[PDB]
């Protein structure tokens, strides 16, 4: 958890654009509310983990 905020400044800046690249396009299609929840909160839309691996 520390090594998220430790490692860089641009790859973690690329994370918040990458977090919409899994949620908007193949997790919440059709729901605009769940689409701007990603673009207003990418780190909240990044542990949504809809790959049901039972974890």
């Amino acid at each position: 958890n520390f090594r998220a905020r430790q490692m860089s400044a641009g790859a973690k800046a690329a994370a918040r654009f990458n977090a919409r690249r899994v949620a908007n396009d193949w997790h919440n299609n059709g729901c605009n509310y769940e689409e701007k929840l990603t673009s207003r909160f990418p780190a909240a839309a990044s542990s949504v983990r809809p790959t049901t691996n039972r974890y």
């Binding site: 400044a9 641009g10 800046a13 690329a14 918040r16 654009f17 919409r20 908007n24 605009n32 689409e35 701007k36 673009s39 207003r40």
Partner: protein
């Protein structure tokens, strides 16, 4: 995401308005100008490999201080990420020319776009020059007013689409500022 047919219903639902023919005639003229919009958006994506080059080579023939090392923008992966960022915004605005609405832009890239650039060390004054050259060639490409490349068309007015692309690119430039 949201388009010109869907722009006119998100305000009418906010007043619980049944959409009748008081505002439908703007959309009959929009669906009149469907193939005009099509004959616009074909010519943009046809030569768009040439457009991202003509931007970022014209961006640097006014400023060689980027390629001066110790600057931000000199090396090739940095130029790959420059030509990553150059094409993707051109890719996004071509969805809005197709949409007739800029709501496909504002969420997928415009949220926090400038604040990541100062977090990366990106000079945004070179970005607003680069999006202008993309704005400069595209209005000559939706018309037949290029240098050598002339697609075939049916004639008539396309400046109303040119006012849309003029109102698209600065809205990106208002967001990367």
């Amino acid at each position: 995401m949201l388009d010109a047919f869907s722009r006119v219903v998100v305000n009418s639902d906010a007043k619980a308005a049944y959409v009748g023919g008081s505002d439908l005639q703007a959309l009959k003229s929009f669906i009149a100008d469907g193939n005009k919009r099509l004959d616009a958006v074909n010519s943009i994506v046809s030569n768009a490999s040439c457009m991202v080059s003509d931007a970022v080579s014209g961006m640097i023939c006014e400023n060689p201080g980027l390629i001066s090392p110790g600057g931000n923008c000199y090396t090739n992966r940095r130029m790959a990420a420059c030509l990553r960022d150059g094409e993707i915004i051109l890719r996004y605005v071509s969805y809005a020319l197709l949409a007739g609405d800029a709501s496909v832009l504002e969420d997928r890239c415009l949220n926090g776009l400038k604040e990541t650039y100062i977090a990366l060390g990106v000079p945004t004054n070179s970005s607003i020059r680069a999006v202008s050259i993309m704005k400069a060639q595209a209005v000559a490409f939706i018309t037949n007013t290029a240098t050598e490349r002339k697609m075939s068309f049916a004639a008539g007015d396309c400046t109303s689409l040119a006012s849309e692309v003029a109102s698209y690119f600065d809205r990106v430039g208002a967001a990367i500022s």
